[PDB]
Amino acid sequence: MKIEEGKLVIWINGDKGYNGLAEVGKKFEKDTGIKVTVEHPDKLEEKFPQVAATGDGPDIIFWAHDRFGGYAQSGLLAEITPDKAFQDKLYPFTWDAVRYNGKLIAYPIAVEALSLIYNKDLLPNPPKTWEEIPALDKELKAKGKSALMFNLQEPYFTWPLIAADGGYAFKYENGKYDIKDVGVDNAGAKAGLTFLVDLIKNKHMNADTDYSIAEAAFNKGETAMTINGPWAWSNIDTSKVNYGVTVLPTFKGQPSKPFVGVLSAGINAASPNKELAKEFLENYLLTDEGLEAVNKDKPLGAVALKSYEEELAKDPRIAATMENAQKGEIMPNIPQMSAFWYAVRTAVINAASGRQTVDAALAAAQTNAAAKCNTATCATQRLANFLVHSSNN
Numbered sequence: 344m345k346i347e348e349g350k351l352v353i354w355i356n357g358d359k360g361y362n363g364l365a366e367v368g369k370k371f372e373k374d375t376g377i378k379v380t381v382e383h384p385d386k387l388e389e390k391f392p393q394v395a396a397t398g399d400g401p402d403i404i405f406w407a408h409d410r411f412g413g414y415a416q417s418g419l420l421a422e423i424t425p426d427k428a429f430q431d432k433l434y435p436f437t438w439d440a441v442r443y444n445g446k447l448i449a450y451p452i453a454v455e456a457l458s459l460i461y462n463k464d465l466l467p468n469p470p471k472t473w474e475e476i477p478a479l480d481k482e483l484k485a486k487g488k489s490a491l492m493f494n495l496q497e498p499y500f501t502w503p504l505i506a507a508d509g510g511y512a513f514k515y516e517n518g519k520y521d522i523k524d525v526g527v528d529n530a531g532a533k534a535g536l537t538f539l540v541d542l543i544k545n546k547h548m549n550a551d552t553d554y555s556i557a558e559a560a561f562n563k564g565e566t567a568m569t570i571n572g573p574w575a576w577s578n579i580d581t582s583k584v585n586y587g588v589t590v591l592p593t594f595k596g597q598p599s600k601p602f603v604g605v606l607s608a609g610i611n612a613a614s615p616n617k618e619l620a621k622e623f624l625e626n627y628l629l630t631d632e633g634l635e636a637v638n639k640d641k642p643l644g645a646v647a648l649k650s651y652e653e654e655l656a657k658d659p660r661i662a663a664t665m666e667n668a669q670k671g672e673i674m675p676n677i678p679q680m681s682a683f684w685y686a687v688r689t690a691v692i693n694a695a696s697g698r699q700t701v702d703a704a705l706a707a708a709q710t711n712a713a714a715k716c717n718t719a720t721c722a723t724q725r726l727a728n729f730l731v732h733s734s735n736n
């Protein structure tokens with residue numbers, strides 16, 4: 344079905360405040376007569392380039408900024424040309440995240456970083472270092488609890504530890520990323536992943552732990568800490584756990600270095616509703632009332648809109664988000680990013696389960712993080728996984 348003129352269809356991930364975004368859509372329809380339909384399909388960031396290539400899909404797509412360079416390189420995004428006054432309503436660093444080859448390719452919404460979230464009743468003094476976590480888990484285990492649970496299935500969550508002692512994605516030099524210099528298999532990456540693998544070998548974490556499992560355990564008071572972003576705070580508030588949000592633990596004396604994402608809204612190049620989409624984003628969403636609706640549903644983090652960011656800034660959870668962001672690094676947005684993420688996901692999963700050694704896992708990741716994907720999902724490049732041998736212990 345080609346995109347319908349005279350309507351807006353919006354895709355946003357299921358962990359964000361889509362019901363709040365729908366309220367903004369209701370206001371848009373009231374004021375303009377144009378219906379807005381908000382959807383949260385699974386794997387939307389993989390599905391988008393497939394449907395958009397055929398002239399179909401949403402008018403507006405929301406994701407962290409890292410996926411957008413790939414979309415832009417494929418010609419799937421409309422150029423964004425806000426006037427300089429509008430640009431001035433948002434922090435200039437947020438616009439920098441949505442630039443690709445000299446053009447703006449999306450509207451920035453909010454800056455996201457992972458923090459350490461901890462249960463103040465179980466653990467009034469959170470650990471400053473990763474190194475002290477094994478001993479903390481041993482102590483808490485004897486008490487019927489555990490130290491730490493977080494999603495080990497998505498590399499976003501383990502990256503801060505991999506990067507802490509020197510892991511990196513692509514070297515940046517002279518204003519551009521060098522896709523022939525990948526840093527997932529240097530001494531620092533090896534050290535970080537080895538520490539994670541050892542936490543698992545020593546039974547302080549389980550390799551199968553995922554987002555739902557870690558969320559449930561924290562929100563039910565079973566584990567003292569988790570690692571998550573601002574979107575997760577809503578469900579924690581509902582649980583009534585007495586929690587803090589703080590700086591991530593250091594590793595080998597170095598700060599954990601999360602990859603920072605800017606939630607961004609791009610416009611489908613095939614949309615016959617480009618001007619309506621721009622009106623929705625500039626005049627309705629990127630306003631105090633618009634972001635309030637979304638943020639009240641699931642917190643956005645450090646919002647791009649200066650006026651609303653100022654209202655929220657006193658929140659120590661946002662302060663902690665910004666503290667972790669500044670110790671981290673903006674995600675590249677280059678087309679090669681998806682290949683990087685698939686490669687690192689497989690490395691962490693294989694190393695964590697004992698399917699491969701850390702050195703074997705990261706050696707493979709270095710090879711394939713660089714490899715060029717012709718598709719949004721890297722399906723053929725991921726066939727490399729047939730080479731991996733089961734442990735068979």
Ligand SMILES: OC[C@H]1O[C@H](O[C@H]2[C@H](O)[C@@H](O)[C@@H](O[C@H]3[C@H](O)[C@@H](O)[C@@H](O)O[C@@H]3CO)O[C@@H]2CO)[C@H](O)[C@@H](O)[C@@H]1O
Nearest residue numbers: 358388389407409410455497498499604681684685688
């Ligand atoms: O691991 C497989 C996965 O890799 C890529 O996903 C990455 C995202 O592109 C990246 O933005 C980040 O995603 C996190 C969001 O930024 C955050 O808002 C929240 O939604 O959590 C996400 C992590 O689950 O990190 C992931 C990598 O973990 C790739 O684009 C995906 O297609 C692929 O499934």
